[PDB]
A paper describes a structure:
Cytochrome b6f (cytb6f) catalyzes the rate limiting step of the photosynthetic linear electron transfer (LET) chain in plant, algal and cyanobacterial thylakoid membranes, connecting the light-driven reactions at photosystems I and II (PSI and PSII). The cytb6f complex uses the so-called Q-cycle to couple ET between the PSII electron acceptor plastoquinol (PQH2) and the PSI electron donor plastocyanin (Pc) (or cytochrome c6 in some cyanobacteria) to proton transfer across the membrane, conserving energy as a proton motive force for ATP synthesis. The Q-cycle involves the bifurcated transfer of electrons from the PQH2 donor bound at the oxidizing (Qp) site into so-called high-potential (2Fe-2S centre, bound by the Rieske iron-sulfur protein (ISP) subunit, and heme f, bound by the cytochrome f subunit) and low-potential (hemes bp, bn and cn, all bound by the cytochrome b6 subunit) cofactor chains. Here, we further our knowledge of cytb6f structure, function and regulation by determining cryogenic electron microscopy (cryo-EM) structures of the cytb6f complex from the extensively studied and easily transformable model cyanobacterium Synechocystis with and without PetP.
To circumvent these difficulties, we developed a purification procedure based on solubilization of cytb6f from membranes of a recombinant strain of Synechocystis producing a C-terminally StrepII-tagged PetA (cytochrome f) subunit using the mild detergent GDN followed by Strep-Tactin affinity chromatography. At the core of the cytb6f structure are seven transmembrane helices (TMHs) belonging to cytochrome b6 (helices A–D) and subunit IV (helices E–G). Surrounding these are the single TMHs of PetG, L, M and N and the membrane anchoring helices of the cytochrome f and ISP subunits, with their extrinsic domains projecting from the membrane plane on the p-side of the complex. In the case of the ISP, this domain extends from one monomer to the neighbouring monomer, forming contacts with the neighbouring cytochrome f subunit and stabilizing an interlocked dimeric complex. Comparative superimposition of the two structures reveals displacement of the C-terminus of the PetG subunit, which moves away from subunit IV to accommodate PetP.
Author numbering:
A (entry chain E), N (entry chain M): 1 to 32
B (entry chain C), K (entry chain K): 1 to 194, 201 to 285
C (entry chain A), I (entry chain I): 3 to 222
D (entry chain B): 2 to 159
E (entry chain L), M (entry chain D): 21 to 168, 173 to 192
F (entry chain H), L (entry chain P): 1 to 29
G (entry chain G), P (entry chain O): 1 to 35
H (entry chain F): 1 to 36
Write the structure that this text describes.
């Protein structure tokens, strides 16, 4: 309930980071 | 006491209706709660806190007739395979937390059903059971899953003895209707009452029905001196397989990646359509 | 593959069945700006039913609708069958989430005026769908034939006895006998696995046909 | 593409809009933008949540049925908590059946009782929203009381 | 010279009324099939069956149960019935239907307080079935024990509420 | 750290992320 | 029996869905439509 | 998360996570820009 | 009403669902003169299937799919249930007549060139329908768990044991165990009452949709 | 208006007729002439025939299953008589499985094997008719043999 | 004989495999037919014609060693409730058709399984059984519907006695291979074959293997004189309810009236459509 | 006046009459 | 720039291959569920069952059969296997699997002809199971019947056809 | 098999007669 | 019928009844003409 | 088990249906089509 908050924050951060990375690296290579 | 439940119901402390045999002689009803973790790992020692709330100041009539404190006791029917962890498995913190409380398996091979008590309720408001979850990987008779943990906890003196003779911690009733019209203390706090009416009252309760008047059929002659009671709490515990959670996490991460890729594909198709309309 | 892009071995199917017609019909529909995330609820309800159609399907291969073998079959599914715990737990959870998504879908429909003219028949078919799902769970709650399900049915099946004229007759008709037992289990299993799946399929077909014919409701 | 504005110059579309239909003819295209890319997102989310709940909170087996020993607390599924509560608190069992059956039959009259006004926004339907909020609160209260003894079932322990 | 609305409707009535008669004659078997067959015996032809479905003999109750005990057995209309031991004999002339008259739960016996206490809503019945407390509207039904066993239907007037048997 | 907490968090983040992806993909709410 | 996690999910998703529907209704009520 | 009863906590978490999911969707919409 | 002749409450449905579209769609088709009495055969098959859908339905209320009660439930249907003899005998006879009508339908289709271009997919889905009907018969033959049905299933289930590698796995999959027992009866009941009704419904939907789209075949 | 002639002056109907379709656009109207008045006749005929067969020849319960005693005669339903026969005279069980599985797979190749000519009349496709007659004769012969001892299942008695 | 089937298998002549116990001793298998009506009405007497066919010009060997005619015999297992009609109920035509044939119930209360024989084959190749059908209206344990009727009929002498010994009406074999070379008539038609290996051929069969020849192991020493044989056959009889047929006739007549009305309605609609065209 | 004969004949004539009515209503074979 | 056919096809491949991976991960439990559980007893450790499902007791099995009498009982994988009484003892070294090798019929034993004769088509076996007549392609499977009753899967060389066990 | 022929002949005759009677009667009363 | 072994008899009856159904349909068609 | 009535129905309806189909094919063979 407490370390779960940290895991939630890290999990959201990791998936937001990979979302933005895929978006910008696929728009960069004109794929999307 | 719980050993009287071992003697009255030597098989199981619970009836098929779900009622614990404790309520057979503990006529009152109170609140009892157990903090069992929702999920536990196999071969992991975990605490189950059984709380038996009652007012510490309130005092009950004792076996002789005087007022006194309340002793608490409980029966916890852990799922098949569970058992109170041996002192060696307990960590130092848990060993210090549980204290010197003594637990019994209530029967041979029924170590999952654990009784405790009587314990002084002044300090044992909560009793920490150091339960040890089984290991389905070794024990082929135990499976992972959600199981029911029943609890029956009592804090007052029982009303009925194992032989059926009532105790002094209850309100006494006249057998029928009659004009008994007599009170006589039997050289103690316990007075006796003597149509033909034969009612005996120990030193425990207090009279509310005056002498020299008509008593109806089955009315409360005495005060009800009980201040405790017995309560049940049926809860659930999950014996969880860690491999299931590992694969669940992997599967959900795959789902989230798939959703991200679906949104990216939608963005690409929107980009394509925005140029196909620009004709 | 988006809708149709460069499908050319596809000329065979288009020449025989003219499936470019349904392709263009599907691609001719538009989603208005006022459609928010809450319009996904009804489909989620359908999603849940699809899961209930699958996992329940699987449990028909191992569940035996007999008072002497129902509980044993359910515990055999949980303990012996590979991923039987997963299938049964998914079935129960997706039943609960079907009903929850249904309630949220009704909240969306009412709080967006989606039941108004000309969508009264859609609301009527939806209420019939809700009744079908509620009785679906009612019939399935006692298939395990445990204490909880058996006693829930023994409670809810003797209720019609309050009706003066056709009370006991209705009680006997639902129970398949005078008392809850093997006949009740067989009738409830038939309702759960055969009758009500077809009833809800027909009601879903009517619901979706009306929605497709009339489209989504207007903006708020 | 981005969005298709409603072609009000079309006679058929305007006729449909006057009739309440014809709203699926403007906005974002349904395929593949929503049906092919947004529907699978929700389907995968629902499947993942249901599988996660199944793994982290499996269905318990229980105890075999005994026709001679009714359990201390018997309850239907959560969505039957309100109606079951009605059965508990209405001393007239026929009235209890009538009240339980008036929910599905009472909802079928909603589109016809509220056919007085064309308005769809909740903030343009004061009486309808008052009735809806009162009914939702009452259903939630009955469902919450269904998990209580029949004595304190009307006060939720006050 | 052509069938107008009236003649066409008359011909439709004739044709589809004959079709509806055929359909009713074909659906009567289906409806009669879906109605469970009456095979519970009779009101006086239901013996006292145990949990396993076998009848409990009157002779067995000696040395098998205590004095004054009340034990559940299958009874009239399949519902559980408390067969009463009278302490000296093994049975009585009646058996108390254990199904609660409020909702339908099987009411357990309570020898200490000499009352039938429904565990779901706390309604109380006395040692003979008469309502004492709780939300129960009616009293527990009575199963007329015959062999001293068969739990026939008790149709004699109530010795508890002084009326005709509500169960009949 | 914990594994039960890990699974519970995974399911909770899946719920949150499904809502987030539906909102982002449809460009608003 | 009572399932506490499922009841928590229900009692969390009902009020938030109602509040979100009312908020979306308010946003569409303070603004116009496309046509 | 490895608690004992998740009725009140479950409801509060469900509400908070729904709101957080909407907020994070809008945050990603804001952070995706318009055109590089 | 023939299709729609003189109605006033029909406007309530027509303004909402546009039922006159369905009316004018149905009333726009014509039956060419080359349609004989032999073109009624395929529909007759459907008729028989509907009987199988009906009388089978009824028999799901009393049949217990367990090895200790299947025979007992079948003779309970035949002897104790009202008109149960009629329902079961109708189910058997209509199964046989379904297969016979389907065979005659194949004969008609082959002998009128109803399968040729552009009706290849209709014939393929028809053959799949035929396999589904044969599976109905095979899985229903063992449901009574009499000696003839039990030995027929024990013979047909051990046939895959000739395939070199996957033979044992196939035999186990069809039997649900090593030998024909309770698992086989449960799986076959699920196939007969759940799997195959839905499979044949999907195949019938495809079949009828293709026939409706492409019409009947031309004259000979 | 009893029979409607095909309007060949319609380009869409002409295209459909060239493609093989469009034959549901001429003749007697489907509704209500056929679907409403002729379909129920066949429905009621089938219902009456099947109910009469059920009443006059009721289904038999049989003998309860005995896993330890094989009946002298074991047979599937009538339509499985040929395939069952193929199972019992073919010595190679694999060949029996192949023969039993080649009926559904061989029947799906009929619209593609016979895709060489657009002739629908049997008298304009003699090879197809000979193959079909041989197949019907073989299926009937195998079905008849399935009700014979395995020795006599081939010749059926031989006069 | 049938009573040897009563003695060997006293519970039922048909084993769980459907095979009559008469085949344990009667090894040959020929044709045996039963003509039972397809459907019979309750409480009606009907004839079951058991045909037991074999050519009358073929004479079998007898026990002593001489040849002679055959004797037929049969067992007819009828469904429960059916029994051979008493001489009081069967008609005079059926009385002269059945002759003085004697039927036994094969067991007490098992009157549905009736045995007969040995009867001479010169006049009893066709046996009429005056079966009496039960009435489910009086008997409540008997139901209408289709039931199985089993038959097992025999013509010649049996190979094996109830004591396991072999009769002379079968082919005799060698215990093993050897050189006997000892053929001599044992004062009758039987031989005594004694390298030295003991075997005795009774008077019935005739030796086929030549003396002084090394015979193989388990080879036919004589021919098989078994002219007769045992054959069984199962059919089905419908105990029909006349009320069922009455309501069936009514239902079908209603169906055909509905069909006629449907065609008339189609004719009316055709005239209406012709009017709508010729406006 | 045989009831079994009456039922068999009724079924047979239902078959024949259904064929004849389909032929008559559709006005040819 | 606009994503051309190649880029859109690659992006489709990525998205729907992740979709396919998730779907396969979900379907693996579904496929493994429909596969019957690995609970077919034990290929070498299952005792002998009678038609009533009970264990056949050797003491009951002894002194209940004649010399050289073969009665079949449930054995390996539920297949009926003959437990041969050779005349002196109540057991033998082997158990002949009654399930025929032609179609699957259970061959009865004629002690009159001292042979296993299939009733379905007339397949005939010798006293030990070796094929001598009929269309049965291979010989009847054997087992190990040991007590002092448990029958185990046969692995040693076939003492009848002089070859390795074809059933294995 | 012989009286059944008579029953069938009479039954066909009766139903054909009622068919023709209904047809000509409804033609006579202008219902058709 | 009231006679068993309805295989050959059943086949002949079905053939004859199909032919008679066709023939009687045509007979009623001919007799219905005004 | 063999059902003589059912097999008789099958063997009476198959040849006559085939004969009728061939007769109809011949009748359409010796004349023209609808157009
Ligand atoms: C008895 C007189 C007949 C005749 C002449 C025909 N049938 Fe039927 N039919 C049925 C179904 C479900 C269909 C498919 C519906 C669809 O295509 O969507 C058909 C189809 C036909 C056609 C072709 C129609 C077309 O549009 O191409 C023809 C010419 C035809 N049938 C002739 C169903 C049934 C029945 C159901 C109970 C019955 C009875 C019949 N048909 C009988 C007949
Ligand atoms: C072995 C125990 C047998 C059984 C079972 C059945 N039969 Fe038999 N039968 C058997 C023998 C050894 C003999 C001849 C004995 C002798 O001393 O000759 C017979 C003889 C008959 C006959 C007479 C044949 C004749 O006289 O030519 C008949 C009619 C007959 N048996 C009938 C019969 C029937 C109908 C059976 C089944 C119920 C049956 N037998 C069983 C040996 C055995
Ligand atoms: C299994 C049950 C149900 C399923 C699968 C389902 C599914 C759907 C779907 C997919 C839609 C399209 C719009 C959307 O998704 O929001 C919809 C709309 C609708 N539903 Fe349902 N629903 C169900 C039950 C109900 C119930 C219980 C009601 C009402 C009590 C209802 C009434 C409606 C109405 C009126 C609409 C049209 C609203 C509009 O167009 O704005 N449905 N439903
Ligand atoms: S199993 Fe077929 S011949 Fe023996």
């Amino acid at each position: 309930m407490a370390a779960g908050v940290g895991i939630f924050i890290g999990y959201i951060a990791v998936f937001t980071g990979v979302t933005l990375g895929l978006l910008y690296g696929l728009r960069f290579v004109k794929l999307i | 006491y719980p050993f009287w439940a071992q003697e009255t119901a030597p098989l199981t402390p619970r009836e098929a209706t779900g009622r614990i045999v404790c309520a057979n002689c503990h006529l009152a009803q109170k609140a009892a709660e157990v903090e069992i973790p929702q999920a536990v790992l196999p071969d992991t020692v975990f605490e189950a806190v059984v709380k038996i709330p009652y007012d510490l100041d309130s005092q009950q009539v004792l076996g002789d007739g005087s007022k006194g404190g309340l002793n608490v006791g409980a029966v916890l029917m852990l799922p098949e395979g569970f058992k109170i962890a041996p002192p060696d498995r307990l960590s130092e913190g848990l060993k210090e937390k549980v204290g010197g409380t003594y637990f019994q398996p209530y029967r041979e091979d029924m170590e999952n059903v654990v009784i405790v008590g009587p314990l002084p309720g002044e300090q044992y408001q909560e009793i920490v059971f150091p339960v040890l979850s089984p290991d389905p990987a070794k024990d082929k008779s135990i499976n992972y899953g959600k199981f029911a943990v029943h609890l029956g906890a009592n804090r007052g003196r029982g009303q009925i003895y194992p032989t059926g003779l009532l105790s002094n911690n209850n309100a006494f009733k006249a057998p029928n209707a009659g004009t008994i019209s007599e009170v006589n203390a039997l050289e103690a706090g316990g007075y006796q009452l003597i149509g033909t009416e034969t009612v005996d009252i120990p030193a425990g309760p207090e009279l509310i029905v005056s002498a020299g008047q008509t008593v109806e059929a089955g009315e409360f002659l005495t005060n009800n001196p009980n201040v405790g009671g017995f309560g049940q709490k049926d809860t659930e515990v999950v014996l969880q397989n860690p491999t299931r959670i590992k694969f669940l996490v992997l599967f959900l991460a795959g789902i989230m990646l798939s959703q991200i890729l679906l949104v990216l594909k939608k963005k690409q198709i929107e980009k394509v359509q925005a140029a196909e309309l620009n004709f | 593959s988006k809708e149709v892009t460069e499908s050319k071995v596809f000329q065979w199917f288009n020449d025989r069945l003219e499936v470019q017609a349904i392709s263009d019909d599907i691609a001719s529909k538009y989603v208005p700006p006022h459609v928010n995330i809450f319009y996904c609820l009804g489909g989620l309800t359908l999603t849940c039913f699809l899961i209930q159609f699958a996992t329940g399907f699987a449990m028909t291969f191992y569940y035996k609708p007999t008072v002497t073998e129902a509980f044993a079959s359910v515990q055999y599914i949980m303990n012996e069958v590979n991923f039987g715990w997963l299938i049964r737990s998914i079935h129960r959870w997706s039943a609960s989430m079907m009903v929850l998504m249904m309630i949220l879908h009704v909240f969306r429909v009412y709080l967006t005026g989606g039941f108004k003219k000309p969508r009264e028949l859609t609301w009527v078919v939806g209420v019939m769908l809700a009744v079908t799902t509620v009785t679906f769970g009612v019939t399935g709650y006692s298939l395990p034939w445990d204490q909880v399900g058996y006693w829930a049915v023994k409670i809810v099946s003797g209720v019609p006895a309050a009706i003066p004229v056709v009370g006991d007759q209705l009680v006997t008709l639902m129970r398949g006998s005078e008392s809850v037992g093997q006949a009740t289990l067989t009738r409830f299993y038939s309702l759960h696995t055969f009758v009500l799946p077809w009833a809800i399929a027909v009601l879903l077909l009517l619901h979706f046909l009306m929605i497709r014919k009339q489209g989504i409701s207007g903006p708020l | 593409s981005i969005i298709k504005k409603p072609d009000l110059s079309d006679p058929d579309l305007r006729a449909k809009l006057a009739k309440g239909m014809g709203h699926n003819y403007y906005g974002e295209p349904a395929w593949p933008n929503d049906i092919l890319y947004m529907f699978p997102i929700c389907i995968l989310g629902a499947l993942g949540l249901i599988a996660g709940l199944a793994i982290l909170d499996p269905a318990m087996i229980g105890e075999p049925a005994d026709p001679f020993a009714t359990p201390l607390e018997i309850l239907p599924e959560w969505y039957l908590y309100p109606t079951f509560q009605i059965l508990r608190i209405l001393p007239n069992k026929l009235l209890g059946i009538a009240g339980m059956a008036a929910i599905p039959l009472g909802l079928m009259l909603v589109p016809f009782i509220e056919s007085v006004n064309k308005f769809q926004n909740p903030f343009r339907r004061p009486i309808a929203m008052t009735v809806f909020l009162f009914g939702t609160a009452a259903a939630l209260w009955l469902g919450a009381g269904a998990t209580f003894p029949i004595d304190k079932s009307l006060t939720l322990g006050l | 010279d052509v069938p107008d609305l009236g003649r066409r409707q008359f011909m439709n009535l004739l044709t589809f009324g004959t079709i509806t008669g055929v359909a009713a004659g074909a659906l009567y078997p289906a409806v009669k099939y879906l109605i469970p067959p009456s095979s519970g015996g009779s009101g006086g032809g239901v013996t006292a069956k145990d949990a396993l479905g076998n009848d409990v003999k009157v002779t067995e109750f000696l040395a098998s149960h205590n004095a004054g005990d009340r034990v559940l057995a299958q009874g009239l209309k399949g519902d559980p019935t408390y067969i009463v031991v009278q302490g000296d004999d093994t049975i009585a002339n009646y058996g108390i239907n254990a199904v609660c008259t409020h909702l339908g739960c099987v009411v357990p016996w309570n020898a200490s307080e000499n009352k039938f206490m429904c565990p779901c809503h706390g309604s109380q019945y006395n040692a003979e079935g008469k309502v004492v407390r709780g939300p129960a509207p009616l009293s527990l039904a009575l199963a007329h024990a015959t062999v001293t066993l068969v739990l026939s239907t008790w149709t004699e007037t109530d010795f508890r509420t002084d009326e005709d048997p509500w169960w009949a | 750290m914990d594994i039960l907490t890990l699974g519970w968090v995974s399911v909770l983040v899946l719920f949150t992320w499904s809502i987030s992806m539906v909102v982002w993909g449809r460009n608003g709410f | 029996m009572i399932e506490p996690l499922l009841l928590g999910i229900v009692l969390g998703l009902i009020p938030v869905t109602l509040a979100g529907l009312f908020v979306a209704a308010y946003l569409q009520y303070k603004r116009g439509n496309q046509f | 998360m490895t608690a004992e009863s998740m009725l009140a906590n479950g409801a509060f978490i469900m509400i908070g996570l729904t709101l957080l999911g909407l907020a994070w969707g809008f945050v990603i919409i804001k952070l995706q820009g318009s055109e590089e």
